[PDB]
Amino acid sequence: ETIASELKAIGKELEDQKKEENIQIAKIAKEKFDFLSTFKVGPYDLIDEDIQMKIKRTLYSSLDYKKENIEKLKEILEILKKNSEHYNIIGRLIYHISWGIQFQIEQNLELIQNGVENLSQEESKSLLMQIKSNLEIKQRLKKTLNETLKVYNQNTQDNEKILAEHFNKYYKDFDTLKPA
Amino acid sequence: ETIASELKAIGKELEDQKKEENIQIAKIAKEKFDFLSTFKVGPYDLIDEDIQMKIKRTLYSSLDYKKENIEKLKEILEILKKNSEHYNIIGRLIYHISWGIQFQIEQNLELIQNGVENLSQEESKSLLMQIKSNLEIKQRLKKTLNETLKVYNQNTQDNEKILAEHFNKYYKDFDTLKPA
């Protein structure tokens, strides 16, 4: 106390975030653009529903459950998936970060659900700090995926510009063609 | 004579080219990757079978009837089609150049089929020159589409490189994320 009051309030906050994401994720599954349900890094990779749920929670939250952004992320991952050298860095985002955050959050929610009374003044202090660090990461990631989408959108746009300048250079007439 | 011998020979050559392209085009329609059959520049554009045939002859010849290249051209045109500002330059390639070449070739084949005897020494000289100029253009274009495909392949490759360096920069760990 009053860390016990702070913890119960931040626990209720996290449980609300979880309830709204459960609803928002359910609609994406019906609207049939839940790519993470079928997403494999390698080819012969097995998919666990519980692990995927946590990944969906992180990735669809950071993209504000927007179909446009969710599809664009699918496209980005599909591009990198082509080269087996990118398999590790995809896993860093999908597992270590996206699943990792939710895994820590579940553990933190459980300590609150178990009872804040069963925790010492030092344990209570650390739990509040940990929750705040995880919530900060959940935002850090959101701001990173935004930059990722900006990088992908910029490249798409640049490709159109380059193709257009090439077309205007060479296809103006018969005389603008490359020599035989 | 012997321009009459040269013309009858170059006419037979053009008729063989036409016969082999007719076969090669027929197989593309069976293997269901003949995008030009359904290709519109604008949205409400009407498609003429005879005009399209000539476009198919030029474009599928230049790409050596390769499915990979034919699909890549479809992708390039689809990208530029998004902006109405690129509608004119697409038409320069599709109609003025691709249909235009075949239209001139048909006229040249007809003058040979009509009879080289019904042509003066000056008309015979000009027809041979014209045929050679058109055959040179058919090569000029082939060497341009090759560069077009190289530009598109380079852009695709550059996009993979950029996305990879972005991923390794920001998704290495939790600490490599963008701070708030």
Distance from CA of B47 to the nearest CA of A (A): 22
CB burial readout A151-161, b (16+ within 10 A) else e: bbeebeeebee
Q: Which of B97, B152, B166 sits opposite A163 (nearest CB)?
A: B152
Q: Which of B82, B137, B166 sits opposite A174 (nearest CB)?
A: B137
Which experimental technique did the depositors report for determining this structure? X-ray
DSSP one-letter string for B73-123:
HHHHHHHHHTSGGGHHHHHIIIIIIIIHHHHHHHHHHHHHHH-GGGS-HHH
- Asked if A89's CB is within 8 angstroms of B168's CB, the reply is yes
Terminal-to-terminal C-alpha distance of chain A = 84
Element (H, E) at B70: helix B67-81
- Count of CB atoms within 10 A of residue A57's CB? 23
- Asked if A139's CB is within 8 angstroms of B93's CB, the reply is no
In angstroms, rounded to a whole number, what is the distance separating the alpha carbons of residues B147 and B168?
Answer: 32
CB burial readout A35-53, b (16+ within 10 A) else e: bbeebebeeeeeeeeebbb
Query: Token pair for residue B22?
Result: 């007719």
In angstroms, rounded to a whole number, what is the distance separating the alpha carbons of residues B126 and B119?
Answer: 10
Nearest to B142, CA basis, from A170, A162, A161: A170
Query: Token pair for residue A84?
Result: 């087996």
Q: Which of B79, B141, B143 sits opposite A159 (nearest CB)?
A: B79
Q: Helix and strand tally (H, E) in chain A?
A: 6, 0
- Count of CB atoms within 10 A of residue B118's CB? 8
Architecture of the B1-180 domain: Orthogonal Bundle (1.10)
Please give the residue of chain B at the shortest CA–CA distance from A159: B155
**Domain extent listing, chain A:** 1-180
- Asked if B79's CB is within 8 angstroms of A178's CB, the reply is no
Size of interface A-B (CB pairs under 8 A): 129
Terminal-to-terminal C-alpha distance of chain B = 85
